[PDB]
Design a binder for this molecule. Structure first.
Ligand SMILES: Nc1ncnc2c1ncn2[C@@H]1O[C@H](COP(=O)(O)OP(=O)(O)O)[C@@H](O)[C@H]1O
Lengths: 338, 267
């Protein structure tokens, strides 16, 4: 209510909306000047444009939310902690603890005594404060085994129910995850896929939507461009409104306004291609100790689809979205052809 | 009085008029059964009272203290009259009840249950040890050196051997009667809970004939009567007066029964 806009802003908003360049402009305009791996932020906009609402006031069934989770993982040299401390300075409901930042109990049920009432109290959590928001997470593979069977509850039921000697609780909490895991080494080992490298099960590894692989640019050539441009960045100490026109705050309402007045819907579009090619897509019986395609993908796919149809504000589903969705998937779904 | 005498007299015309078990009714002989063994813990059946005279359910709650006292006078004036040699060992009596048509679970009793007949059970936890008490008011005058005489409330009359004088006083550590004492903490069983929460509890007092009978971690059955601590410092208050609750013990039944136990039919 305290952010309802005037109709004059709709001019500039839909003016940005009217061009296919918008898919790339905001992906370019998140970072201050970081002009590498822009192939990924174009998917992060699908969480910034925080998903779809196929509401469940209909029958009470199945609670299939537009559940979006996507993660990054690679070396510590890439600016994951830095980028995400900046993303803390982007997202409204910004939380930022991290792997071995606080335990499961360190994330839920901060139950303890208070001298204000001077009495013992059933008390707070951390995740549930960020309902529908985000929590940037770092250095994931340091957390205790008690934790990380908590997130199974949320990621796969999107709920929480708590019971201690005091209260038994059935609260509400749901949100989208971001996190920036790291391995037990400095570098991901080649000839050792992520299927075993990082510390997780045989098929719960791939159980996230898609982990957009990241690694240091293994190339000396790129070093000069940033070592020059991003030091001149400091050396001049101000910015310039080049072709990718940075709007000071008018960009931010295209994010803001576009959660509320939209309801993506499917006519005939984003079903039929894999419904056709399912034979060769589902010959996945072959493999020695592998992981591959399963009949859950299209849930996540319809999610990503109606997400990218939200951008451009297509109230009916987008058909182009399917193409870059397939691109998104097969960008990293045979990183283990081996 | 006319009617207010009839209570003991109906007990007298009860314990040799009401009969079961094909003659030679128990309480004709249960009382001497107990005076033999020097126990002084005679026990009453309520169902037998309903079989003989049902009057004794409405006459009771208006002050069951007085009901129990008018009970014990009868056991005295029976036993110590018919066994006059007896007046050596204890010289005091009271009675017990073990038949009540109701088991009131915990977390069920309120101000409506005040100062009247009860049944409840649960489990013991930590409580005190074994301590004696006082029983009688007797002082020692300190001006004139006499004793004021024999007399939760103080008395202190002006009448005394010291020319009904000597407001001051002092006290000896003897020639006054004493009384054993013990406390308990009654908690409810972890079976019949509201399925996973904290439990509730009350404190209970038991008295001298009933001690070194209970134990930590035990099963329980008690008649009890609901107390009222008369003042936990009434004054400028909290959001509540600081008031409290106990039940006073009349008669226990244990549920384990780890002794040679059952009373005996005639045949
Ligand atoms: N492409 C890049 N753009 C910007 N900074 C980069 C880039 N690659 C490496 N860096 C460096 O990485 C650092 C931030 O890394 P950080 O995310 O804090 O590591 P970690 O998350 O492992 O703690 C910055 O100081 C920056 O100099």
């Amino acid at each position: 209510k305290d952010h309802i806009f005037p109709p004059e802003r709709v001019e500039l908003l839909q003016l940005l909306a009217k061009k296919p360049d918008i898919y790339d402009r905001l992906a370019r305009a998140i970072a201050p000047s970081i002009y590498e791996n822009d192939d990924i932020k174009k998917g992060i906009l699908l969480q910034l444009f925080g998903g779809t609402k196929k509401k469940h006031a209909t029958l009470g069934r199945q609670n299939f939310r537009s559940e979006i989770h996507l993660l990054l993982c690679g070396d510590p040299g890439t600016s994951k902690s830095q980028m995400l401390q900046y993303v803390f300075n982007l997202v409204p409901r910004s939380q930022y603890t991290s792997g071995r930042g606080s335990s499961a109990v360190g994330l839920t049920a901060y139950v303890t005594k208070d001298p204000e009432t001077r009495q013992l109290v059933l008390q707070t959590g951390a995740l549930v404060l960020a309902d529908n928001g985000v929590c940037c997470i770092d250095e994931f593979d340091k957390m205790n085994d008690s934790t990380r069977s908590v997130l199974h509850e949320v990621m796969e039921q999107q709920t929480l129910s708590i019971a201690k000697a005091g209260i038994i609780c059935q609260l509400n909490a749901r949100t989208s995850i971001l996190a920036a895991a790291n391995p037990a080494e400095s570098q991901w080992n080649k000839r050792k896929n992520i299927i075993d490298n990082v510390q997780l099960p045989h098929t719960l590894l791939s159980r996230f939507d898609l982990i957009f692989l990241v690694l240091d640019p293994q190339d000396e050539i790129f070093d000069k461009r940033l070592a020059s441009h991003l030091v001149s960045l400091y050396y001049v100490t101000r910015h310039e409104e080049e072709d990718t026109m940075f709007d000071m705050s008018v960009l931010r309402d295209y994010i803001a306004y576009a959660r509320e007045h939209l309801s993506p819907t499917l006519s005939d579009e984003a079903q039929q291609r894999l419904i056709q090619a399912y034979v060769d897509m589902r010959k996945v019986g072959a493999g020695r100790g592998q992981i591959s395609a399963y009949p859950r993908q299209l849930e996540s796919l319809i999610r990503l689809s109606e997400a990218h149809a939200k951008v451009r504000l297509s109230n009916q589903v987008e058909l182009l979205d399917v193409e870059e969705a397939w691109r998104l998937h097969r960008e990293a779904l045979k990183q283990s052809a081996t | 009085l006319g009617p207010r005498t009839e209570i003991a007299n109906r007990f007298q015309s009860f314990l040799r008029t009401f009969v079961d078990e094909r003659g030679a009714y128990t309480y004709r002989d249960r009382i001497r059964r107990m005076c033999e063994q020097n126990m002084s813990s005679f026990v009453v059946s309520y169902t037998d009272l309903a079989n003989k005279e049902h009057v004794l359910a409405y006459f009771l709650p208006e002050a069951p203290f007085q009901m129990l006292e008018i009970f014990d006078k009868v056991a005295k004036d029976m036993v110590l009259s018919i066994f006059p040699t007896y007046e050596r060992v204890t010289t005091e009596i009271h009675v017990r009840i073990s038949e009540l048509p109701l088991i009131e679970e915990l977390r069920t009793f309120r101000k409506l249950h005040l100062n009247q007949l009860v049944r409840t059970l649960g489990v013991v936890t930590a409580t005190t040890g074994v301590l004696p008490q006082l029983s009688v008011i007797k002082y020692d005058c300190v001006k004139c050196g006499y004793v004021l005489g024999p007399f939760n409330t103080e008395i202190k009359p002006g009448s005394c051997p010291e020319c009904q004088s000597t407001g001051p006083f002092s006290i000896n550590m003897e020639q006054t009667l004493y009384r054993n004492y013990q406390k308990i903490t009654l908690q409810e069983s972890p079976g019949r809970i509201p399925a996973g929460r904290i439990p509730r509890s009350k404190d209970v007092i038991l008295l001298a004939d009933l001690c070194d009978q209970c134990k930590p971690g035990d099963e329980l059955e008690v008649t009890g009567i609901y107390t009222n601590n008369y003042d936990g410092s009434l004054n400028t208050d909290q959001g509540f007066p600081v008031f409290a609750t106990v039940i006073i013990a009349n008669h226990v039944v244990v549920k384990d029964s780890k002794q040679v136990v059952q009373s005996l039919t005639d045949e």
